[PDB]
Amino acid sequence: GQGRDWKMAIKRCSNVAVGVGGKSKKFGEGNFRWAIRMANVSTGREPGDIPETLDQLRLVICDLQERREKFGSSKEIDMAIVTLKVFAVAGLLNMTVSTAAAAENMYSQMGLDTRPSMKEAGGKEEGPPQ
């Protein structure tokens, strides 16, 4: 979460509004680091584990929504989930969305809330460490 791809994705997200205003503040880099870190700890991943691909990010979001379903919603888990969806849609897919609500809606319409099977995925991501 320090490379050129990370920063460009963050730059894309910086124009997205947190609230469905209007007047609303926009997302900042720290918001994404917080959301990833929160989701990582919550799902038993190493805290600094940055998703590199859309597939990896989708699985984190899936794990976190399943946690939300099992143990219940909260202002914090809800914010983490929507923040990750903004990262997927505006960051990784480079899609113009005005608000976090719009990203959430787009993420859902594209079918991304579905957790793909391992066979569906074709194969996990197995590559060199550096």
Author numbering: 4 to 133
Sentences from the paper on this structure:
Matrix protein (MA), p15 in FIV or EIAV and p17 in HIV or SIV, is the N-terminal subunit of the retroviral Gag polyprotein. During the viral replication cycle, the FIV p15 matrix protein oligomerizes to form a closed matrix that underlies the lipidic envelope of the virion. In FIV, HIV or SIV, the N-terminal domain of Gag undergoes a co-translational covalent modification of the MA N-terminus with a myristoyl group. The structure consists of five α-helices (numbered h1 to h5 following the HIV convention), which give rise to the close packing of adjacent helices typical for retroviral matrix proteins.
FIV full-length p15 protein at 6 mg/ml in MES buffer pH 6 crystallizes in the presence of sodium acetate pH 4.6 and PEG in the space group P21212 with one molecule in the asymmetric unit. Despite its intrinsic flexibility, the C-terminal end (Met113 to Gln133) is clearly observed in the electron density map because of the stabilizing crystal contacts of the C-terminal residues 130 to 132 with the complementary monomer. An analysis of the electrostatic potential of FIV full-length p15 revealed a highly basic platform, with helix h1 having amphipathic character (residues Arg7 to Cys16). The C-terminal end of FIV p15 is mainly unstructured and extended, whereas a long helix h5 is observed in HIV p17, and a short β-hairpin is reported in SIV MA. The first interface (interface 1) implicates the conserved residue Trp37, localized at the center of helix h2 and the C-terminal end of a contacting p15 monomer (Gly130 to Pro132). Of interest, the indol group of Trp37 makes extensive contacts with the Pro131 of the complementary molecule via hydrophobic stacking. Unlike SIV, HIV and EIAV MA, FIV p15 appears monomeric in the crystal, although it is dimeric in the protein solution used for crystallization.
